[PDB]
């Protein structure tokens, strides 16, 4: 019934609201990770800075989908942001692996959303997803895979020197 | 028979020529609207400035399509630019509503053009439409819907104060 | 019935509307010419730039007459902009000759308009036509005649080298 | 068992975690409000900007309490962020009144937290709450009360002109 | 088996490796052309500069596809770069025509690659091809067609003055 | 039969063409190495940057010999650029050792070329090889030997920390 709505299916609107909830959840997971590494018994400041920056980026992604929802005449329906799976992320390597798993989950959701927008013949939504989300997801997954590989090769879970030097040289 | 033509169907060429005429028509409609608000008995200078700017933008859109037609080896066939439906646009609110209706007409034509380019397997034409036209149309429709909503809430057709203050504060 | 209208005859108003239509037609003809020289099988970029600049100038001329029509309390009545006579302008020399013919048509219409404004004793309209249109028309006709002479002396229709070097040295 | 923990009671730690959840909830409520006013049928851009700025401020407040929790050797335990009470905030005045109610809820929670820290003889926590939260809350409550008063005096729920001019002059 | 691979079919990976080989081949063809025009018995310095610039561009295109292959978790498999078809390119016009034929070959390969990525439902690969390759190919084909048209109209193969002046004025 | 050719034997011309092919091959080997270290399961960015820089340098060396071939009136005859020996370079140390072996191969070819130019009494070709290639080769071999020594002393193939810190401190 919106005066600006055109070629915007209800299923696309619902999937955009689900993706908003997902992006907000990812922001909250990265916030949890960031303040894990700020703990006195962990104390990796550049890990904390990295994951805080990621949480702010995911908040920006969610706000951009909300802006899209209003642009197409859809209506934003927000849900509870579930707490993350862990309070103790146990190491820098484990947190990078969980971040990698999370970003691949987000990517898969975006590919489902693009498939839906293609099936409903919504070229503006397809192009929005392609230009603003898919390449950013691919780049994030590649960066996290690079970090996981470098931590593993340096012997990260056993050797705290590996996590320390990675914090200094890569994330610093 | 053009030496540069590749993967460019005749139906796509004809639809691009129709879209060129459509964009030129929209430019002429906005020119009419702009000099309606320049009338002494109407006298809304920022409405006039807004619609003149829109007229020039639509001319740029048409020239971009013509450029595309030459880039793909198609041949531009121009038609008469029909005169707009009204000479008297009757109010700022009415003109914004007519502009909204016009932009949704333009958007529907572009979505038909994208569906045609998808059916003819022309990825360059699809990406051209997505990157240069679709988002711009969505943004224009959202802006015009915002203006119509603000004018209606201010009591625009009865109260000339509403049109005056909208001219000053939003369009100024 | 306009509160601003003074010494402005109805025949002058109708002739101004006809001149607006004619300036818009000239702008559309120059747009056609400009994208003719942008074609891959023609490819004279500075001819295209020259005629695009002329189309924008003619649009400015039309908008200035519309501004005059509102200044004097007349009412703008727009008509269809007819398509130009040709889609294929066949050469740079032929397009310059057609442009020359067009500008002399525009000039003759303006001289008819000045004769009408003189007969109706409208000194403001006479001075408007003299200051903004007549000297610009004679300068345009002189420039186009210069271009036609230079192309003909260079052997333009047979020798493509003439059109090429004119594109580079005069229009570039 | 933290090596940094000194004079930091478990009840204070639990109340800090509750306050973190409450600040995150407030950020999510303001995000909801901000994109309500971004809707095409509402379209108050400066209301949207104001509430988005408030959401970012509440996120900063939550991150500062998380930083405090790590500074004192407490452990952050995050909970679900509940969805806000409304999706449709119905007007600028209603949203300001709900924001006022929310900020007074946040202030009451902070006063309970200060009473707890006073009863547990934790001067650092008391001073943290006083310097970073209490003045900011009373300034926020005073500003929102000012906005509510100005909207009501302008006749906000009936007259959309009041909301429009408040959006322009106070929030703009 | 790559930790970053998601929605990336093996056939897409193989087609990306074929496209890498083809871009490297095109770079080598343009290198051959560039040093043809550097010969003492040909001596067209701006033709040489133009084709050397094209060879460096094609090298950049190949490196960007290799980057893409690593980003998606595919594995680069390089092949022999075949020698170009000619050592003697015989004229500036013939070299421009061969360059045009080459770019249309590259464009057809990219359209096959986009059709494959569309059939395998890989939106990131489709968007990568659209944003980085298709419009660049269309622009290159249009530019080369323009050059071929201008050389032919100037009488290029018989008249060396045509090639000389084109070298100076268009490519210089 | 070239008007420029003087004191330039056919055997020297053939050996210059062989050296061009060898420099292009070396550029392609370094390109392969560079995008090996860009892989997600390798992820040594400064190794990738180093070998990409080397590939561009070898391309410059090849273009300089092509320029020499045209300067002396010889004629460039290009051959296929063979694919490198490996797709998987297995470690930073192994890639540095292969690069060292490659540069010593290139150096031996250049010494054969200088011996040929000395035997044919071509002082310009001898001086060209001495000034532009021989000192650059011995500097490259010395640098690669330094890198291999430093990697071996740090325990490179077993310890990934060695490769990581070398990537950061020496190549970064």
UniProtKB/Swiss-Prot annotation, chains A, B, C, D, E, F:
GO annotation terms (biological process): immune response; intracellular iron ion homeostasis; iron ion transport; negative regulation of cell population proliferation; negative regulation of ferroptosis; negative regulation of fibroblast proliferation
Organism: Homo sapiens
An MF annotation (GO) of this entry: iron ion sequestering activity
Protein name: Ferritin heavy chain
Disease per UniProt entry: Hemochromatosis 5: A disorder of iron metabolism characterized by iron overload. Excess iron is deposited in a variety of organs leading to their failure, and resulting in serious illnesses including cirrhosis, hepatomas, diabetes, cardiomyopathy, arthritis, and hypogonadotropic hypogonadism. Severe effects of the disease usually do not appear until after decades of progressive iron loading. Neurodegeneration with brain iron accumulation 9: An autosomal dominant neurodegenerative disorder associated with iron accumulation, primarily in the basal ganglia. It is characterized by global developmental delay apparent from infancy, and progressive decline of motor and cognitive skills. Clinical features include delayed walking or inability to walk, spasticity with hyperreflexia, ataxia, dystonia, and poor or absent language.
UniProt record similarity statement: Belongs to the ferritin family.
Tissue: Expressed in the liver.
Effect ascribed to mutating residue 23 to A: Reduces iron binding and oxidation rate
Location(s), subcellular: Cytoplasm; Lysosome; Cytoplasmic vesicle, Autophagosome
Keywords of the record: Acetylation, Cytoplasm, Cytoplasmic vesicle, Iron, Iron storage, Lysosome, Metal-binding, Neurodegeneration, Oxidoreductase, Phosphoprotein
Annotated residues for binding of Fe cation 1: 23, 58, 61
Annotated site residue numbers, Essential for association with cargo receptor NCOA4: 18
